[PDB]
Amino acid sequence: AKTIKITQTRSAIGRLPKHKATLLGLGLRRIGHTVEREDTPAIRGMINAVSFMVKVEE
Amino acid sequence: GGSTRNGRDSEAKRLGVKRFGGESVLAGSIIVRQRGTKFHAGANVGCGRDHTLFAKADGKVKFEVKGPKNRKFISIEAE
RNA sequence: UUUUGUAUAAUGGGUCAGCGACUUAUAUUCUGUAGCAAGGUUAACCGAAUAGGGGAGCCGAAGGGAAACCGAGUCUUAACU
RNA sequence: GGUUCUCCCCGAAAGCUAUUUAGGUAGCGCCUCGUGAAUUCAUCUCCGGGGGUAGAGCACUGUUUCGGCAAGGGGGUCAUCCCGACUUACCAACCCGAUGCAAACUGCGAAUACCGGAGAAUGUUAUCACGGGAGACACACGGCGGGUGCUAACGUCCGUCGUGAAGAGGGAAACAACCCAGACCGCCAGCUAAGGUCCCAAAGUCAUGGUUAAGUGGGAAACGAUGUGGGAAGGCCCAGACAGCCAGGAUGUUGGCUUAGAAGCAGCCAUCAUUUAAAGAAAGCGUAAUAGCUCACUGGUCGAGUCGGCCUGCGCGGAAGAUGUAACGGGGCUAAACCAUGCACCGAAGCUGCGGCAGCGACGCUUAUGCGUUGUUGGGUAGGGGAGCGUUCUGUAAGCCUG
RNA sequence: UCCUCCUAAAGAGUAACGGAGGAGCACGAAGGUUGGCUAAUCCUGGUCGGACAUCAGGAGGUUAGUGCAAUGGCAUAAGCCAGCUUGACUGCGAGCGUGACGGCGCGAGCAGGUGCGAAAGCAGGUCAUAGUGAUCCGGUGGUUCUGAAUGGAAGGGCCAUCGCUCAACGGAUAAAAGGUACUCCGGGGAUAACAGGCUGAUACCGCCCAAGAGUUCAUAUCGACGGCGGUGUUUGGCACCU
RNA sequence: GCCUGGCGGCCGUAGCGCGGUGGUCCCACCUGACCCCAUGCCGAACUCAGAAGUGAAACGCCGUAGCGCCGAUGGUAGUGUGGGGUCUCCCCAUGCGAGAGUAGGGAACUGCCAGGC
């Protein structure tokens, strides 16, 4: 499948440590970092876990 | 009605979890009362006294859910 | 200044000035640094009182055991285990 | 309680256990500097494993309602001839058919969490031991998970998430803890968040759609009213509805049953047939009862929606308090009220661009070491650790400067 | 001070005079091990038996038994018996679990000596979780440890033997009790009182609603029952700022 | 293939109800009891020696989709993280997801050895 461009909107500052660990696992910094993540179901499930504050592009 | 005295010693709770072994001693969990919920099978013994899952030979635990009706087993096998 | 927390109707301050506070004394050790090294160091005193002598005494290189006793071993011990 | 001049690196606690212990202190949790050897960790997916909270339940325990049968015990009675019999409000076993409760029960049991594999992805100098120092063991708050309290308190007792403790900035009138976001330092620079754009006071009286009719919005309950838009049926409904206006209110009928009497006129049987311009054995007030009537029900007229409920929303009346409007910050008010989506503008110490500073690393260019590109930590109290600038002393200092 | 369960959260910890009970020992046997067996309860039926002493059979149950708390175990029996029996063993110990320690549980491995059994296998105590008093020490037996001039020896040690409800229990000293509104010292709304806040059960009132009173009639006037508010505002709760 | 026995595995698909069915083989009743052995007494139990009697009880198999048992899909209870509100509940975003029932499944399956056809 095609790889997915990720951006952080909103910030995770108020969110629980488990979700802060998801944003860290996704490699995200200063609310946007020019990141494009792997085409796996495993990363799709990691995006789904924080989808209320992560933005996705294909 | 006050105080109550309640007690405060021990927790007698699980320690030995998942796939486990023992280099010189295999003991598993050291728990009170348990003699009729899960049973030892293979190189492992108990049911004193003892409260332990002590092993008389070398091998590792995998846990079993299969057995007659209500019986389930803490099975140990060599590699 | 007090307190978790005070613009605080919680204590304090008229103001300018002369003032006012973590040390050296001794023992041991940790660290630093250095001299010497299975050795190191002197004190009082002597003396040419910041030299040189003075190693008394102390710290160290072997342990086991109440101890008698044994020692690269030794206490437990009938023992080897 | 008094406890000192200047730049920095890392970064706590009000918890455990003991104490003549609840003001201190000491072993464990949390902070930190050096030394030696070194990657430290989680989120995602699936597999396996110990699992009984949330939910579910009545099998077993204890409790329980409703219906029925009901041993034996406790109570009452009459017979003693009828096969002894009536009763079960009480205590309780059996049983048929149902239903509530449970931390202390289980013919069932998640979400999540936790432990380890099998696998992908991302980035922090980490982890461990030894050698040195600590600080705390009386904090407070908003939310969530539960008890407690009057399903009260700015009350109480814990667990538990995050924040104030030690957190600055934008928003909540003014506000710690709530909302937006975590601040290395600048830019007569851009871009957004929560919030906001009639005026006080910077920005849409914006575009378009939804709703109420009032100072609602801008304090407020149970309760009450043809206040009313929407939704699905039912009835009356356009050779003719609801309301109004005018005109019609009997003939069968002196009905039958009960009773105290009752011409519709408190009960019961029913509730039809007939005529027409037109009608209930009855609707209501009323009388001793009819009547009186005002009506039910049709005609003409006018005229198209309407009556009673059901369902779903928004409003009204429900509505007394004290220094002075005083329960939208205040004013304004017909949207200049609330609400949704779109694009604007205003919006932070956030994001971007550009400019400065400290530590350690990286890419490239260039060379008696300079210039570009950059990864990345920089809010800090307790406390741990590193380095600067002044002040003064001794030597240099009977040198050297000078009346 | 010791022991258990629940509240307590699909690990543990985890507060409330939150909910409720136990211990500060006893069995030489109720230990060990080999062999045999296993309930309750009801009904039926029969002498010596006054109303009832018998046990056999069915119906049926792991709904009997165990030193005791509650929790959980237990018939492979730890329950009931038959025999043999004293392993209610000694000195030790890789290691694991556990509390901050004291203290403690589990246990491979070695020698020695017992016991059951055909042998395997089990036996260093009871069905497990509570049954104590350290340190200090007085008295005593032993001791081929020592007692400093030498040899004995008071004394010190080692090894046997015992004891402080010191229980305020983890124990402040061969020896220690009460009172202060006559005092008094350090600290404080951290902590009460006279007042500020919060709440409005209590308090007084109204409304929904109505068993009834009001010779009729519930609602003019008044109201038992149940419900929902008006108030700040008292009597209390509460412990923030003092 | 089929039938059975032992160790068993798995343990309700392995249960219940009701019916069918086997004695070549194995299995139980059965037929007897000195000796070794046993009895607070006993060939009752334990135990031995066997084939006249039987396929009943006991043992084993099986039809039967009625109930149990297992239970999809859809929905429900609950719930992790997030935004709000009309606030111990509701509405939204995004994931997980029982318990009960339904349709469907299901009157098992099998390792080693041995006897029998």
Swiss-Prot record, chain A:
PROSITE patterns on file: RIBOSOMAL_L30 (PS00634)
Gene Ontology terms: cellular component: cytoplasm; cytosolic large ribosomal subunit
Family per record: Belongs to the universal ribosomal protein uL30 family.
Domain of life: Bacteria
HAMAP family in the cross-refs: Ribosomal_uL30_B
SUPFAM superfamilies: Ribosomal protein L30p/L7e
GO MF, one annotated term: structural constituent of ribosome
Subunit structure: Part of the 50S ribosomal subunit.
Name the UniProt record assigns to this protein: Large ribosomal subunit protein uL30
Something else known: This protein is located near the guanosine triphosphatase center of the 50S subunit.
Disulfide partners: none
Pfam families in alphabetical order: Ribosomal_L30
Keywords per UniProt: Ribonucleoprotein, Ribosomal protein
GO BP terms: cytoplasmic translation; ribosomal large subunit assembly
Region forming the signal peptide: none
Coiled coil: none
UniProtKB/Swiss-Prot annotation, chain B:
Keyword NADP part of the UniProt annotation: no
One of the GO BP terms on file: ribosomal large subunit assembly
Keywords: Ribonucleoprotein, Ribosomal protein, RNA-binding, rRNA-binding, tRNA-binding
GO terms for MF: ribosome binding; rRNA binding; structural constituent of ribosome; tRNA binding
Superkingdom to which the source organism belongs: Bacteria
Keyword field contains NAD: no
Coiled coil: none
Gene3D superfamilies (alphabetical): 2.40.50.100
SUPFAM superfamilies named in the record: Ribosomal L27 protein-like
GO CC terms of this entry: cytoplasm; cytosolic large ribosomal subunit
Region (Disordered), start-end ranges: 1-14
Family affiliation: Belongs to the bacterial ribosomal protein bL27 family.
Subunit details: Part of the 50S ribosomal subunit. Cross-links to the 23S rRNA. Cross-links to the A and P site tRNAs.
Name of this protein: Large ribosomal subunit protein bL27
Organism per entry: Escherichia coli (strain K12)
Gene field: rpmA
